[PDB]
Automatic annotation (TrEMBL), chains B, E:
Record's protein name: Ighg protein
Protein source organism: Rattus norvegicus
Stretch of the intact protein here: 21 to 241 of 467
Chain ranges of the Ig-like domain: 11-95, 126-218
C-alpha cells in the first residue's frame, strides 16, 4: 500500500508567512486530501482532490501537486493555523495517511520562569517525596533541566514532561519531578533545579533547603 | 452532522471490546462509514469501511478477524469489534463518514473518537498533593502554585483550578507513566496579591476510579 | 424557398382536430387491449402454475405437465399465426415500420385477433418473448382499424394514427410513456424521407393508454430496483468500456437472431405442421425450464431486480446469460408472436451486473455497486442490436428511476451504438424489414 | 421500394470524421458554457461586494446597484449593436435559421460578442437565462470547427451545427437528454428531411455535460427534494392547469413580440438610444435584485422556494406580474440572452399558485402545491415556445420527480393544445418568420 | 409494518395527555399519519391527520387546541395531545398510516391502540389469584385452571399463559367494574396429563400501574 | 360531514350463507372502504375503493354499491368471518365511519363445561373470598347460572361476564364470580354453581365443600 511521507515533520513559521509542507508518495497517487488536526480535536477535512478547499477553509490555504509529490500551502499563515496536517490518498487502495506535519507558531525567545517545590507534607506522610520543578513559558522548546541534591548532581528518579505549544503566548512549559523515598529525601538538605535555555548562557537555578 | 463514538476504555491484553459510533444529523444510509485510529503521539491509520447495506466491508491489511466492522442503520450506529487486543490496539478510534469530490474518497466528517487502552495494570485513584512555595520563597509579582497528581491509572485526569474560574496561567503537563501508574502536575500562576490572601484550590477528577478531589494550596508554615 | 419557409413557419404545429381526437380513441383502445393481454398472459402463467401443484408429487409427471401445457399453448399460437396472419409472427415491429413506409399492408381484421390470442399462448406459456411485439403491432393495427372505420383520409391521418397506435402500444408495455414517443421518433418512423407524423397526436395516444394501464396496474412497478448508489466522475470510463463490449456483442447477437431465423426455417421448411410442432416443442421446453431454473425462461422481468441487487453469484450470472441467449433466439427466431424487446433488457441487466462484480473487486477504491453497471447495461443491448439508444436509455430511466446514473447509462449506450457500427452491425428490425421486403421481391 | 431496401441496410452510418468532430465541438461548447456561467457568477459576486462597501447610505447603495447593472448592461447592448446584430436576443431563432440555410453563422463575430455580451447582461442581474448565450455560442462553435477543418457536405454543416446547439442547451441546465430532444423537436428544419446525425448530437452533448460536471459537480441548479405523488383522481386538475397555460401562452407571445416593437421606437435603430435604453433596464434589474430579488435575476433561485410553498398567495402573484414585466423588458429589448430560463420560473410560480388554491379547495386529495408547481414549471415552455417534449424532459432532468410524469405531461399537452386553438405560434419560429420576412422586404 | 401507540391511561377531567405512536417497518415519511378513536362499545371516529412534512394538519370538527397532532419523522413517531379532557375523550386511540387506491384515502394500517380513561380515581395494580381445582376435583381428560385478576384500575390488563405458549383453550373474560375497581378472570383448559406434572403460569400485565405479575397455578395443598 | 349508516347493526348467519350488509350515506359518496374488526384487535382494511380486496382477504368477500348505497358481501360466509364491519368514506371531507355491522355466527348446540374454584389461599389472606365459576364453550349464549351456599340460594355479590363469540368454534363462555368477605365465606361449607342451558333440562351443578 502507498506510503505517504510528509516532508517537514515539524516546522515553525511566524504569522503572515508563506508556509509550504510536502507529501511524497512511494508510488503514484492523485487527488490527495489534507486534514487539519488541532491539539485535542478530531481531524478535519481541509483540502481535498489535491486543491479544493472544504467549505469554511480560509483562502490563504491552497494545495497542489501531482504523480508522486503534493504540497499544502498557506499564503500568510495565521495563528489559528498552528496544527498538524495530515495528507491522505485513496487513488489507490487501501487509503493511506502521511506521517503528518506539525505546524507551530514560531515566536520570540523567552527565558523560563523557574519554580521549585518541596514535597508536600501529605506526600511525605506516605513514604514518597516528589520534588517538583516547573519551567514555565519559555521559548524555543529545547531546554535542559539538571537536578542537584546537596550540590551533587542527580539523574535517577527524575521525570520530565513538556506541554504542547501554548495557544496564548506560543511558549512551551516543562515539569521536572525528582521522586525519592521519604528516607532518601531526608538525608539531604539542599535541593536545586537548574534550567539551561537559549535565553541565557548562565542557567537559571532555583532551590530550597529542608533546613 | 455529529459522530459520537463510545465504548473505548481499558481492556486486558488478549481481550476484545466493541466500539460504537452514534450518528446524527444526516441520513446514515447512503453513506459509507469508516474507522480510523491514531496511536498515542502517532499518525492516522485506516481500520476499515462498510458500505450502506453492509454488502461490502474492507479492512486494512490485518489479521483475519482482528476487526469486525458492522453497522445498524436502524440505530444509525456503526460498530467496530476488536479481538485479541494487544498494545498496538491502544489508540484513539475515530469513526468517519466517507465521501468524495471527483471520486477519490476522503474522510468527510470525523467524530471526536474514543480512547482504547490495552493493558493489564489496575485502575488506581490518584493522590493529590499541593505544591506550595517553600518557606523561603521571594514573593515576586506573580506566584506559581500547583499540585501533584500521582499514582493513578488509567488516563485521564482532569485538573482545573478554583472550579475553572482560574483559567489563565494554568498549566497541566502530560502525564508520565511509571510502574503501571500515571503522574502529572498542574501549575497555576496567579498574582502575588491573589494568594495566600485568597483561596487557590486545585480540583482533580479521575472518572475511572470515581474520584473527585479538591486540594487547597496553603502557604507553608 | 425562403418565402415558402416563412409560409410554413407561421403554419407549424397545426394538427387537424379530427386527427387529434382520433389519436385519443386509438390510445384508449390500445391501452384496454394492452391490459386484457397482459392480464390473459398472467392468467395463463397462473393456471399453468396451479396444475404443477395438482401434480406436485410425481416429479416426472410434473416436469411433464409443465412441458405439455407450454407446448399445447405455444402450438395453438404458432398455428394461429401460420394459418391466418403470417405477418403477425415474430416481433411485429419490423412489420409496422414497413407500413409507415407504405411497403406493407395492415390487415388488422386479421392480425388483431391473431397476434392477440396468439401471444396469449406464447407469452402465457412462459416463452422468452416480451409483450412489446404483441402490443406495438396490435397497437398500430388498432390505429389502422379506426382509420378505416372512420374513413379518415390523407397521409397525416394514416401515418399518424399508425404511429400513435405503435407508441401507445410500446407505452402500455413498459408503462413508459416518454419511451413510447421517443421510440416512434427515433426508430419506427420512415428513416430516410420527411413524414406527416404529428408528434402532438402521438402524445395524446400515449397518454390515454398509459392512463388506461394506470387504471389497472397501479401501485406495482414492473421493475422495482430501489435507489441505487451514485457514480463518481473517475468511475465513468468504466461504463465506456462496458459500452464497447455491448458494442462488439450487439451485432453478433444480430447474426444469431437472423441466422437462427433461417436454420429454424429448414426444420419445417414452410410447413404449417413442422412449424406448429416445432413451436410447441420450444414452447414446452420453456414451460419446463420455468420450474427447474426460471431465470432462463419467461419474460425476464423478474430477474432484473434480483440481478441488480447482487443476489446472484458470478457463476449463476454467466449461466443465466448463455441459457437465456439460447432460449431467446429459439423463441424469437422461431417466428413465434412476441417481442425480443424485453428479453433484451434482461440480457443487458445480467451482462452488466457481471461486468459490475468484476469492476468492484478490481477497484475497491471506487466503492462500486454492481447494480449501477447492471443499469448502464440493461438497455445497452437495445442500443447495440436494435440501435435505438435514446429510446433505450429513456426506456431504462422510465423503469428503474435512477436518473443519477444518467451519465453512465448514456456513455454505455453510446459506446454500444458506436461499436455496433464500426463492426458492421445493423438495426435489427431494419434488417428484418430489408429481408422481409427483399424476400417479397426475390420471389418474382 | 428497391431504394428503401438499399437505404435500410445503410441506415445509421455516420462518417467517422463527423463523429470525431461532434466530439471536439461538445468539448469546446462545454468549456465555454463553463467560463461563461463562471463569469456571470463572478460579476454577480463583484456586484454584491460593492453593495457591502456602501452598505450604509441606503440611497448610495440603491445607486451603485443600478449603476453597476447599467454600466454592464450597456457594455453589452453595445457589443451587440456594434459588432453582431444577430447575437442580440435569444439566439435560438437565429440558429434555427442557419439549420434552414437562411442565415449566416458569423462565428468570428458572434462568439466574442454574445459571450462577453451576455457576460454583461446576465452578470448584471438581468431577467435572461444562459440558454440564449450558449445555444448560439454553441452552434457557432460547431461552425467554427466546420470551417477551421473545412468539413464538407450538408451532413457536416447541419450536424456540427445541431450538436453545438444541443451541447449548448445541455451545459445550460446540466440536462443532456433535453439538449438532444430540443434539436429533434425544435431546432431542426421543421418541414423537410435533414442530414442531422442524431448519434453525432449525442457525442457532443455528452462531452459538454462531462465538461460541465468537471466544474459544477455536487450542486444542482434546482434542488427540490422528492415531492409527494399524484393520485389518479387528481389528474384532471393538471389538465385544467394546462388549459390555463394554454390561453396565456399565446398572449405572452404577443407581449414578447409587441414589446419588441414598442421598444424599437424608443431608440428607433439608434446605437445610442439602444445602449442607453439597455443600461436603463439593466440598472433597473440590479436595483430590484436587492429590494425584491424574486422579480430580478435568472429566476432559478426562487423555484426552490416557490415549490416548497414558502411564498404566500400575495407574494406569488406579485412575483408573477413583476416578473412578466422584467422578463419582456429584458428580452424584448433585444439584450443577449435566453427567455428560456425565466419562462421556467414563471411556470413554477404560476403553478404553485394554482396549487395553493387546489389544496384548500380539495383537502381530500391531500395535495402539495409543489407538484402543480412542477407540472407548470415547463408548461409555459410548452405553450409559448411550443416544444413540450423538450420541456417536460427539461423539467424532469432537473427536478427529478419522475412520479409526476403523468401530471407534467397532461399539463404540458393541455398547454400546447390550447396555445393552438387560440392561434398562438412557436415563439422562436415567429421570431424567425419576422427576422426572415424583415429581410426579403 | 408495525404501529405501536402508547401514553394512554388515566387522566383527570380537564387535564391533558400526550399519546405517542412508534412506527417501524416502513418509511415514516411519504406517509400521512392519522389518529382515530373508538369509544367503549361504539364506532370509529376520525380525530385528525398530519402530512409528512407537517405542513398540513387537519382535525375533526373540534375546537381550539382540543387536539394537537404533531409528528417527529426523526423518531418515526406520531403524537396526539388532548386537552381539557372530558368523558367524551375516554376511548381507544388508534394511529393509522394513511394511503389510497384510486385516491379516496383510507386508513391503511392501524396500530393496536392506547386506551385513554378520563376519571378521578387512582391507578391501582391488580391482585392476581390462582384458581386451582379444589382438593376434590375429579381429574378428567381436560383440567380447567385459571386466575383471578381483581382490584385494578383502569383498563386494561393483558393475561397470557406460559408466556403465551399456551394459547389454545384460553379464555379471558371481559372485566367487570365495581367500586371503581376492575375484576376479571382467565380460564385455561389444558390436558390432565399436562398439569400438575407441568408448570402452568398465568401472566398478568397492567401497564397503567407498570405491573407485571406471574402467578403459578399449583394443585391445592 | 357525511353520515354513513350501516344497515343491519347486528346480524346472524349460518356458515355457508350469502351474507350482505348495507352502508347508506346521507349525501353522495364513492369508493368507500370497509374495515373488519375482530373482538380484541385493531380494525383491518378489508375492502377499499368500494370493491377491491386488500391483500389476504378471501375471495368470498366482495364489495359494491354507488352514490348513497354500498354493500359488503360474503358469498358463503365462514365462521372466521365473525366480526364487526365498519364502512368508511373519504370521497368527502372529513372522512366518516359507519356505525358498524356486527356479524354473528349461527352454529350447533354446545353444552357448557362448568368449573368451580374456591377462593385462593392468597386472597383469603386479605379478607376477600371470591368463588369463581367458569361456564366454558357453550352455545347458544343464553345461559343461567345460579349460586347456592349451603344449599341456600345466593344472588348478592354475584358478578357475571360473558366472552364474545369465539373466532374458531363460535361458542360462548361465561364466568360467574361470587365475592364475599373471608368471614362470610368461612361460616358456610357447601358452595355450588348451577348452570342451566338449552343443552339440558337438568342444570349442570359443580360444587365443593370447605371441609
Ligand atoms: Br422477425
Ligand atoms: Br432570437
Amino acid at each position: 500500500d502507498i506510503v505517504l511521507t510528509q516532508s517537514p515533520a515539524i516546522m515553525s513559521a511566524a504569522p503572515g508567512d508563506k508556509v509550504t509542507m510536502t507529501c511524497s508518495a512511494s508510488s503514484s497517487v492523485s487527488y490527495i486530501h489534507w486534514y487539519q488536526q488541532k491539539s485535542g480535536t478530531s481531524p478535519k477535512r481541509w483540502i481535498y482532490d489535491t486543491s479544493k478547499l472544504t467549505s469554511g477553509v480560509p483562502v490563504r490555504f491552497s494545495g497542489s501537486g501531482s504523480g508522486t509529490s503534493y504540497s499544502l500551502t498557506i499564503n500568510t499563515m495565521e495563528a489559528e493555523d498552528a496544527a498538524t496536517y495530515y495528507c491522505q490518498q485513496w487513488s489507490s487502495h487501501p487509503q493511506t495517511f502521511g506521517g503528518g506535519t506539525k505546524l507551530e507558531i514560531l515566536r520570540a525567545d523567552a527565558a523560563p520562569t523557574v519554580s521549585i517545590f518541596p514535597p508536600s507534607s501529605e506526600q511525605l506522610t506516605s513514604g514518597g517525596a516528589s520534588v517538583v520543578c516547573f519551567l514555565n513559558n519559555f521559548y524555543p522548546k529545547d531546554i535542559n533541566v539538571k537536578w542537584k541534591i546537596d550540590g551533587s548532581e542527580r539523574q535517577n528518579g527524575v521525570l520530565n514532561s513538556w506541554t504542547d505549544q501554548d495557544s496564548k503566548d506560543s511558549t512551551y512549559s516543562m515539569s521536572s519531578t525528582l521522586t525519592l523515598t521519604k528516607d532518601e529525601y531526608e538525608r539531604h538538605n539542599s535541593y536545586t533545579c537548574e534550567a539551561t535555555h537559549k535565553t541565557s548562557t548562565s542557567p537559571i537555578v532555583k532551590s530550597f533547603n529542608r533546613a | 452532522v455529529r459522530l459520537l463514538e463510545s465504548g473505548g476504555g481499558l481492556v486486558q491484553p488478549g481481550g476484545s471490546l466493541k466500539l460504537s459510533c452514534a450518528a446524527s444529523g444526516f441520513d446514515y444510509s447512503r453513506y459509507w462509514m469508516s474507522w480510523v485510529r491514531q496511536a498515542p503521539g502517532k499518525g492516522l491509520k485506516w481500520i476499515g469501511e462498510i458500505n450502506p447495506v453492509s454488502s461490502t466491508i474492507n479492512y486494512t491489511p490485518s489479521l483475519k478477524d482482528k476487526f469486525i466492522i458492522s453497522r445498524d442503520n436502524a440505530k444509525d450506529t456503526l460498530y467496530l469489534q476488536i479481538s485479541k487486543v494487544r498494545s498496538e490496539d491502544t489508540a484513539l478510534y475515530y469513526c468517519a463518514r466517507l465521501y468524495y469530490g471527483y471520486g477519490y474518497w476522503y474522510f468527510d466528517v470525523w467524530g471526536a473518537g474514543t480512547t482504547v487502552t490495552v493493558s493489564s495494570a489496575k485502575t488506581t485513584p490518584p493522590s493529590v498533593y499541593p505544591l506550595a512555595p517553600g518557606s523561603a520563597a521571594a514573593a515576586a509579582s506573580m506566584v506559581t502554585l500547583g499540585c501533584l497528581v500521582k499514582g493513578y491509572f488509567p488516563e485521564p485526569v482532569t485538573v482545573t483550578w478554583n472550579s475553572g474560574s482560574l483559567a489563565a496561567g494554568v498549566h497541566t503537563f502530560p502525564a508520565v507513566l511509571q510502574a503501571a501508574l500515571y503522574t502529572l502536575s498542574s501549575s497555576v500562576t496567579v498574582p502575588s496579591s491573589s494568594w495566600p490572601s485568597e483561596t487557590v484550590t486545585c480540583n482533580v477528577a479521575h472518572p475511572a476510579s470515581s474520584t473527585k478531589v479538591d486540594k487547597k494550596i496553603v502557604p507553608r508554615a | 424557398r425562403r418565402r415558402q419557409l416563412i409560409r410554413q413557419l407561421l403554419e407549424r404545429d397545426k394538427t387537424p382536430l379530427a386527427i387529434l381526437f382520433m389519436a385519443a380513441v386509438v390510445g384508449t383502445l390500445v391501452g384496454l387491449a394492452a391490459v386484457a393481454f397482459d392480464k390473459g398472459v398472467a392468467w395463463l402463467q397462473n393456471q399453468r402454475m396451479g396444475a404443477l401443484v395438482h401434480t406436485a408429487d410425481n416429479y416426472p409427471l410434473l416436469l411433464t405437465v409443465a412441458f405439455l401445457c407450454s407446448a399445447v399453448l405455444a402450438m395453438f399460437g404458432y398455428f394461429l399465426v401460420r394459418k391466418y396472419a403470417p405477418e403477425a409472427g415474430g416481433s411485429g415491429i419490423p412489420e409496422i415500420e414497413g407500413a409507415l413506409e407504405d411497403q406493407r399492408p395492415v390487415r388488422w381484421w386479421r392480425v388483431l385477433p391473431v397476434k392477440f390470442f396468439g401471444g396469449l399462448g406464447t407469452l402465457g406459456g412462459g416463452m422468452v418473448l416480451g409483450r412489446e411485439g404483441p402490443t406495438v403491432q396490435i397497437g398500430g393495427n388498432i390505429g389502422r382499424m379506426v382509420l378505416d372505420i372512420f374513413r379518415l383520409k390523407g397521409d397525416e391521418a394514416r401515418h399518424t394514427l399508425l404511429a400513435t397506435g405503435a407508441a401507445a402500444g410500446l407505452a402500455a408495455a413498459f408503462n413508459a410513456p416518454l419511451a413510447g414517443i421517443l421510440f416512434i421518433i427515433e426508430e419506427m418512423r420512415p428513416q430516410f424521407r420527411y413524414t406527416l407524423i404529428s408528434i402532438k397526436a402521438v402524445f395524446i395516444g400515449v397518454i390515454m393508454s398509459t392512463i388506461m394501464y394506470r387504471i389497472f396496474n397501479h401501485e406495482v412497478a414492473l421493475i422495482d430496483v430501489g435507489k441505487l448508489s451514485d457514480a463518481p466522475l473517475n468511475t465513468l470510463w468504466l461504463y465506456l468500456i462496458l459500452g464497447i463490449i455491448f458494442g462488439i456483442f450487439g451485432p453478433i447477437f444480430n447474426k444469431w437472431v437472423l441466422g437462427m431465423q433461417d436454420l429454424l426455417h429448414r426444420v419445417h421448411g414452410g410447413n404449417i405442421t413442422k412449424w406448429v410442432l416445432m413451436g410447441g416443442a420450444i414452447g414446452g421446453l420453456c414451460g419446463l425450464l420455468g420450474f427447474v431454473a426460471p431465470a432462463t425462461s419467461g419474460g425476464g422481468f423478474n430477474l432484473i431486480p434480483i440481478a441488480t441487487a447482487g443476489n446472484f453469484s458470478m457463476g449463476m450470472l454467466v449461466f443465466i446469460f448463455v441459457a437465456r441467449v439460447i432460449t431467446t433466439l429459439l423463441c424469437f427466431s422461431s417466428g413465434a408472436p412476441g417481442g425480443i424487446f424485453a428479453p433484451m433488457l434482461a440480457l443487458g441487466t445480467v451482462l452488466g451486473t457481471a461486468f459490475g462484480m468484476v469492476a468492484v473487486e478490481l477497484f475497491p477504491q471506487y466503492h462500486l455497486e454492481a447494480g449501477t453497471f447492471a443499469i448502464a447495461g440493461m438497455g445497452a443491448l437495445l442500443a447495440a442490436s436494435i440501435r435505438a439508444p435514446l429510446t433505450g436509455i429513456i426506456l431504462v430511466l422510465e423503469m428503474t428511476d435512477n436518473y443519477q446514473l444518467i451519465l453512465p447509462m448514456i456513455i454505455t449506450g453510446l459506446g454500444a451504438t458506436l461499436l455496433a457500427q464500426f463492426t458492421g452491425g445493423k438495426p435489427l428490425e431494419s434488417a428484418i424489414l430489408a429481408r422481409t421486403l427483399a424476400k417479397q421481391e426475390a420471389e418474382q
